[PDB]
Amino acid sequence: GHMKNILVTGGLGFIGSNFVNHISSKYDNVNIYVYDIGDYCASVENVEWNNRTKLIKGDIRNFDLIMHTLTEHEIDTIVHFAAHSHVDNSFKNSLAFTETNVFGTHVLLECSRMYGKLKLFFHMSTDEVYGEIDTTDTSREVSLLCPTNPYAATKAGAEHIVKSYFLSYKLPIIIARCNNVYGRNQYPEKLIPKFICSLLDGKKLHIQGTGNSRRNFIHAIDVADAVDLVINNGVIGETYNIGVTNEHSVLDVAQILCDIAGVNLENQLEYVPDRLFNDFRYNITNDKIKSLGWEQSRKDFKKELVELFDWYKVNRHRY
Amino acid sequence: GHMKNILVTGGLGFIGSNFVNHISSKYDNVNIYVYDIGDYCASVENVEWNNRTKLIKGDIRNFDLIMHTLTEHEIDTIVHFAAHSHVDNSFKNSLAFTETNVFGTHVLLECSRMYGKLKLFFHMSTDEVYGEIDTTDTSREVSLLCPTNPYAATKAGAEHIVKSYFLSYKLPIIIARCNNVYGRNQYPEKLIPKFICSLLDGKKLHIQGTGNSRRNFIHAIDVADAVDLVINNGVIGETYNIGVTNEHSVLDVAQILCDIAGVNLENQLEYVPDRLFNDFRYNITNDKIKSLGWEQSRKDFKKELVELFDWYKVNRHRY
Ligand SMILES: NC(=O)c1ccc[n+]([C@@H]2O[C@H](COP(=O)([O-])OP(=O)(O)OC[C@H]3O[C@@H](n4cnc5c(N)ncnc54)[C@H](O)[C@@H]3O)[C@@H](O)[C@H]2O)c1
Ligand SMILES: Cc1cn([C@H]2C[C@H](O)[C@@H](COP(=O)(O)OP(=O)(O)O)O2)c(=O)[nH]c1=O
Ligand SMILES: Cc1cn([C@H]2C[C@H](O)[C@@H](COP(=O)(O)OP(=O)(O)O)O2)c(=O)[nH]c1=O
Ligand code: NI
């Protein structure tokens, strides 16, 4: 399309690698620079490497390496997936979220502003944030709801700065928000792959608290397609929600995976301490992204988890 | 009320030193730990040193020094004024706002959470941030408007993190927002003291852009009083506006200070580049603070500036 050289931050990770493999198989003209710090949730084997795919090892906070990359590889598009992932009950956990999600995003934006040649800065965000739209003008966000935990506050803070680069300097940003993603290439510490891999290794499923927490789950293939559509067709400066209706509690998910595994839910569940923080996901609409022509292609959650269960059976040794 | 041992971040700066002197003068049994990095806008001469006031030199990002200070000095209250001030048109300027305003605030909140014995975390913010309430009667903020520049974006980011510590962990936070403050102890780089010191040093007044940008100006004595009142009587978790009706353009202010200096406006004014970013300030009310029993004691702007002009004549050699 209007993409020749793209910098995919976090391209060794779960969503980043799914996006990189989608672009490399759809658009054989596009040079893809995977920019990634290579931490434990990352894997070279997530990406189908070819003569278009190159790896740059670095932190998004590395101003000088980023400036070198944008100028020397003539980057037209940043696709920013490099957000912090690891949640735990230990002191300073949320600080790493601010350092990567707020400060790291900000370094990328300022580099982009100094470079001055970007055609698009695509920022990936989550349903931890709820953008309220102008009742006058539904293309326009006026406010974000107050996050209830510091993890979610770093996501809101990142979105405010990204948008401010467009409103102040005309940096060409687009933000997308996504539900919880499931699919191939996810390190098994998030619910679905952790439970699948636990069920494959004979072990019990850790239920934090009551197991009544609810998420919406969207397939990685539907996400990769939505991002592709928004990058190529989206209105610069706008935010796109990539939501589905596919809401399950933690216990609902345990039930489905136990059913797929041929084992009884009761005697698989071990109850474990709750997270210490307020953990609220928003139902986000998908009307704007549908008007771009996006259609959810993986609607049968049960059927997709059967396939993914078998994918981890073959591939989990990778992690 | 509750204040015995207080940690005042940025207490060598403009608003912080005015607050320290106020607490020292009004109470006789509050120990004040002035916590400050000693940047060029700070002065030890700003503080009236006594038996109850001690300087700890430190960055608010210094987790281990903060943790030693909270625990060994049995701090009950943090009064957090250490925000980044220095605006210019230079690359990377806004990055230091994220490091101090977002990451620094977050270090203080996480230290406070780990310490577990704070009675109050007071966060000083600005009229660059505006929030919307749930209902007139409950007056709880449920959203922040989207900021139009990255400077304001960092102030919004800080407020989201501060509030989330109350909402997730019951950290006892109060936020206050302020108009532009004027008074003693300000480094001459903000409008009023820069113009007063330029008039005294016989130099030209720099008008950035058109000089039609407007601010509201509140006296530091009125701000220190409001912060004391909010700390002792405010509802934990809420935000309070500290803000008068005292609106003036840059050119309105230049004219008042030229009149006071005994000089003609024409021939004092040099026109210099505008700031590169979009800056509009939300008009705030002071009803919530009036209900706690605050009353603006310094209402006569020109009268206060005549006195402030006199104070810089005597004391500006400090800077
Ligand atoms: N996974 C989900 O369910 C979900 C839901 C909504 C949207 N998102 C968004 O998707 C993006 C990626 O999520 P994911 O699940 O694929 O995560 P992941 O942890 O699998 O991938 C993140 C990648 O970024 C890299 N990284 C981390 N910090 C970095 C830094 N400072 N510099 C450079 N590289 C760094 C890691 O090495 C990793 O490869 C995030 O921006 C997040 O906001 C996540
Ligand atoms: C990984 C995991 C998650 N959970 C719960 C915590 C959350 O309510 C939910 C999803 O957690 P997780 O997959 O970590 O996702 P998120 O980043 O959206 O919080 O599953 C468990 O109960 N046990 C587990 O082993
Ligand atoms: C310091 C200064 C400010 N200004 C303008 C910039 C702003 O529009 C206004 C106030 O600036 P400033 O005092 O820096 O306050 P704020 O942090 O709220 O921006 O005065 C000048 O025109 N010349 C100057 O020399
Ligand atoms: Ni190179």
B234 closest CA partner among B303, B139, B99, B97? B139
* Radius of gyration from C-alpha coordinates of chain A: 19
CATH fold for the domain made of B180-219+243-280+298-319:
UDP-galactose 4-epimerase; domain 1 (3.90.25)
Ligand 3 atom having least distance to the Cα of B250: 20
Please tell me the distance from the alpha carbon of residue A283 to that of residue A130, in angstroms, as a whole number: 9
Q: How far is CA B127 from CA A35, A79, A205, B131, B182, in A?
A: 38, 33, 48, 10, 15
B62, B67, B73, B75 alpha-carbon torsion, rounded to 10°? 100
Is A285 annotated to bind a ligand? Reply is no
On whether the A1-179+220-242+281-297 domain is CATH 3.40.50.720, my answer is yes
Q: Order of strands across the sheet with A31-36?
A: A53-57, A31-36, A5-9, A77-80, A120-126, A173-178, A239-242
A128 classed as catalytic: yes
Binding residues of B: 126
To the nearest whole Å, the CA of A238 is away from the closest chain B CA by: 13
Q: Where are the domains of chain A?
A: 1-179+220-242+281-297, 180-219+243-280+298-319
Give the Cα separation of A79 and B253 in Å (integer): 46
Q: Which residues of B touch A161 (CB under 8 A)?
A: 98, 150, 153-154, 157
Structure tokens of A137? 């003008």
The verdict on whether A88 is a catalytic residue reads no
> Which of the following is catalytic: A151, A182, A240, A282?
A151
Q: Give CA angle at A255 (A250, A259), nearest 5°.
A: 150
**A–B CB contacts, 8 A cutoff, strictly below:** 141
Cα B151 to the center of its chain, rounded Å: 15
Give, for ligand 1, the residue of A36, A173, A279 to mutate: max count of ligand atoms closer than 8 Å to Cβ: A36
Helix H or strand E segment including A241: strand A239-242
DSSP states of chain B: ---SEEEEETTTSHHHHHHHHHHHHH-SS-EEEEEE---TT--GGGS---TTEEEEE--TT-HHHHHHHHHHTT--EEEE--------SSTTHHHHHIIIIIIIHHHHHHHHHHH---SEEEEEEETT--EEES-TTT--EEEEEPPSSHHHHHHHHHHHHHHHHHHHH---EEEEEE-EEESTT--TTSHHHHHHHHHHTTPPEEEETTS--EEEEEEHHHHHHHHHHHHHHPPTT-EEEE--S-EEEHHHHHHHHHHHHT--STTTEEEEPPPSS---------HHHHHTT---S---HHHHHHHHHHHHHHHGGG-
Mutation for testing the A interface, residue in B97, B102, B130, B279 having most A CBs under 10 Å? B102
Furthest CA-CA distance within chain B: 58
| CA–CA dist A172, A162 (Å, integer) | 10
Query: Resolution of this PDB entry, in A?
Result: 2.0
Residues A36, A76, A127, A304: which is the catalytic one?
A: A127
Q: State both tokens at B40.
A: 């060029």
Count CB atoms within 10 A of the CB of residue A246: 18
Could you give the C-alpha distances from B12 to A267, B35, B45, B128, B184, in angstroms and in order? 61, 8, 8, 23, 12
Residue pointed to by tokens 């993190």: B161
Q: Does B110 touch chain A (CB under 8 A)?
A: yes
Helices (H), chain A: 14-26, 63-72, 93-97, 105-115, 150-169, 191-200, 220-233, 250-261, 287-291, 301-315
Asked if A125 and A177 count as a contact pair (C-beta separation under 8 A), the reply is yes
Instruction: Select from B95, B141, B156 the Cβ nearest to the Cβ of A106.
Output: B95
CA-proximal residue: ligand 3, atom 7 (nearest): B213
The single residue of A33, A35, A36, A128 carrying the catalytic annotation is: A128
Facing residue for A161 by CB, picked from B109, B113, B150:
B150
Give the closest residue (by CA) to ligand 1 atom 38: A13
Buried b (16+ CB within 10 A) or exposed e, A30-48: bbbbbbbbeeebbbeebbe
- Which experimental approach was used here? X-ray
Residue A130 known to be catalytic: no
Neighbours of ion ligand 4 (CB under 5 A): A 72
The residue nearest atom 39 of ligand 1, judged by CA position, is A13
